[model samples]
Target: EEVVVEIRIRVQREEKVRRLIKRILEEVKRESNSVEVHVETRKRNGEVEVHVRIRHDDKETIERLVERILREIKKLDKNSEVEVRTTTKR
Candidate 1:
């Protein structure tokens, strides 16, 4: 079984957001061999909007991944917004 993860985050700076996104993807890939990640970005009201999608064959692993990722994000940017959605993928 495969699972899909979708995340939306709002950050302060473009450079910082890039670093955060790259770090997140790296950790995710390191956690699972069969993983695919997609990152998209846009600017809204001076905030960088980052959208991330991760697909993996490891069940329920993303829950822990997301928990740690959010913790890291909060450490770096305390006021950022994050939304995480997980679902089964056929």
Candidate 2:
């Protein structure tokens, strides 16, 4: 049940990530026993670096959640440079 995802995007003022977290936690309680999401931002040379961490449950839940997020983001901003990084929990 090691489900954690790291997403680094270029943005400043935002709150969609929070909404996603809430939705996942509230809507899919069984799929994910617990869901923790952290949002951080860093001021880069020109753009704002947004680091989002999501910890949930199994594979299906994490994949569906993040994939949808990425999809919606790309749908909104076709030229977006958003990337999702998945790592070993050890």
Candidate 3:
């Protein structure tokens, strides 16, 4: 019962986090031609972890965009233990 509420809150917060980050990386989206920017949440040992996955075929662009996103993520939530994952289809 309690675990469900916790997951819901995390999902809500991370959804907004993803949105803010996505808004900032509008350029990356335009350039990628096929981009995937999203947040994934997993429940492990009754704990929820949030990971923001940004995917693009080009590593250079995704890496650069992550730099900017992390800055904003920190500014928005300093103590956030958010995980970041960047995947490139090489």
Candidate 4:
């Protein structure tokens, strides 16, 4: 069964956010060849919104990827908020 994972991160630094996005895509690609990932960034009201969407069949892989990505995001800003949602692919 495949699932879709959506991650939303709020941070203050666009420079670091771009770097993090690159690292995230690279890491996910390196970790699994069976996944599709997309990232988008938007700035509004002086804050940056990072949206990461992932589609994968393996739940364990998604779990690990989510954890890793959250950790890195937190590293960028310890007080930042990260929202992650998972749903079965229709």
Give the alpha-carbon lDDT of every model. 0.81, 0.64, 0.50, 0.84
Q: What lDDT does model 4 reach?
A: 0.84
lDDT string, candidate 4, 1-90, tens digits: 898999998877777786778877877887788889989998998779989999988888989988888887777678878898999855
Q: State the weakest 10-residue window (summed lDDT) of model 4.
A: 11-20
Candidate with top TM-score is 4
In model 4, how large is the Cα lDDT of residue 42?
Answer: 85
Clashes of each: 0, 0, 0, 0
Pull out the clashing pairs in model 4: none
**What's the TM-score of each model vs. the native?**
0.82, 0.67, 0.49, 0.86
For model 3, residues 34-79, the per-residue Cα lDDT tens digits are 6565555566665555555555555666666666655665665666
Q: Which candidate's lDDT is highest?
A: 4
State the TM-score for model 1. Answer: 0.82
lDDT leaderboard ranking: 4, 1, 2, 3
Worst 10 residues of 1 by lDDT: 26-35
Roughly what TM-score does model 2 have, to 2 decimal places? Answer: 0.67
TM-score of 4: 0.86
Alpha-carbon runs more than 4 Å astray in model 2: 12-33
Error of 2 at 35 (Å): 1.8
lDDT, candidate 3, residue 77?
60
